[PDB]
Amino acid sequence: MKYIIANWKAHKTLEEASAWVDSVNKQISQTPDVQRKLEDDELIILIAAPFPFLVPLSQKISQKNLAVAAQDVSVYGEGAYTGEVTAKMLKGVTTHVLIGHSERKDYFHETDEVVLKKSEQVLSQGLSPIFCIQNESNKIPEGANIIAYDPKEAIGTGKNVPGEETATFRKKLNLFPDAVFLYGGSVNPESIDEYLSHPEINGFLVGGSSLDPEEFFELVKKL
Amino acid sequence: MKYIIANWKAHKTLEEASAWVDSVNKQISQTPDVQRKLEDDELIILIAAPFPFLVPLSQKISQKNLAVAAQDVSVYGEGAYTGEVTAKMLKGVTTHVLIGHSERKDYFHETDEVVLKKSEQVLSQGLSPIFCIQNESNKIPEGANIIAYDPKEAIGTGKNVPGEETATFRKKLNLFPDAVFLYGGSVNPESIDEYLSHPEINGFLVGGSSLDPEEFFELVKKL
């Protein structure tokens, strides 16, 4: 069960986003080994798209284990919180919610308490958090089954964490042995081979190399 | 040119939201005086819906001067800002962007600098900010043509600001004489008559009394 997440971050218009889905759809139908892994639950591809694109894009998708995911969610539930997108609103549109991304720590001063609250919202609606952490000091909820290690220094820098340090890291975390562990941080078609030889690493969170749907599919083809 | 904005805040599922649009659509077609004002640009109805609902709901709408609006927008432009919805992304989906809501000051510590940055993003994409203020101390950009006075003490409390104090307030703001000025804060079908006799007030921002599409249409029928 390999995971790969295209994290567009704050990129793309509705039109650019829909073109991306047509490019990935066509490549999937053109690549029978990828189709096999998807159909056999050996692979899942998550498109972590901005909130306003989740529903239109998900209407363009019929491939099993290809699905949209939210990039974030409100710390609040339903209520008078102008601007907030709640887990309950996502219950309709997606099954996976990325939370705790390093960028939200840097730019919006998200703390562990904040992310843990976001995690409780996601789980209480029956959704799956993809719980991002920056290091060993970030607290991890026990309802979290999918963790993404995305350290700030590796994001967009080319300085990906050595594969064996990444595998070592996973063994040292506050995680059930059967949890899903992803790596994110300058994963590109050259970088990714450094992690595929470590079974402790179950997938990838891909930012930069996810914007071009062809580059992203080079990554998909390697899992 | 009267404005009325249904601010759902952090309410509704996709299904609840779509039902709302069918209820308002049917009432409009059933109310020829409302249809006339809409067609003659005497009235605009803005549905300020959560980000993931903007595109599906706008596909259910063919009535002129009935349109969706965003409740907020990122301080950032396109870039590596996981979770952010930018003005550029909204250029596709909506023409109006609510910014500066009092709830975002209380819960997310938005400051004038923050809201002014959000305003610059909205305008640079050719969209219309609906610029909310809490009092006379909030700075107002000059590119802002639509201002909504939404003081915290009047929100959800029943303590709406007296109509004449509201009209007086508008005359004292840093605003061009031809700017659009809305009032928000416990506007309901009883409250609203207190403001309709003051021509300084060009419309309403409606939170609580907007969730029920029938109550909301009682408000619409009074403009």
From TrEMBL, chains A, B:
Gene3D superfamilies: Aldolase class I (3.20.20.70). Pathway: Carbohydrate degradation; glycolysis; D-glyceraldehyde 3-phosphate from glycerone phosphate: step 1/1; Carbohydrate biosynthesis; gluconeogenesis. It comes from the Bacteria. Homodimer. The keyword Isomerase applies. One of its GO terms (biological process) is glycolytic process. Belongs to the triosephosphate isomerase family. It is an enzyme of class 5 (isomerase). It is found in: Cytoplasm. Its EC number is 5.3.1.1. It catalyses: D-glyceraldehyde 3-phosphate = dihydroxyacetone phosphate. InterPro entries: Aldolase_TIM (IPR013785), TIM_sf (IPR035990), Triosephosphate_isomerase (IPR000652). Keywords: Cytoplasm, Gluconeogenesis, Glycolysis, Isomerase. This is Triosephosphate isomerase. GO terms for molecular function: triose-phosphate isomerase activity.
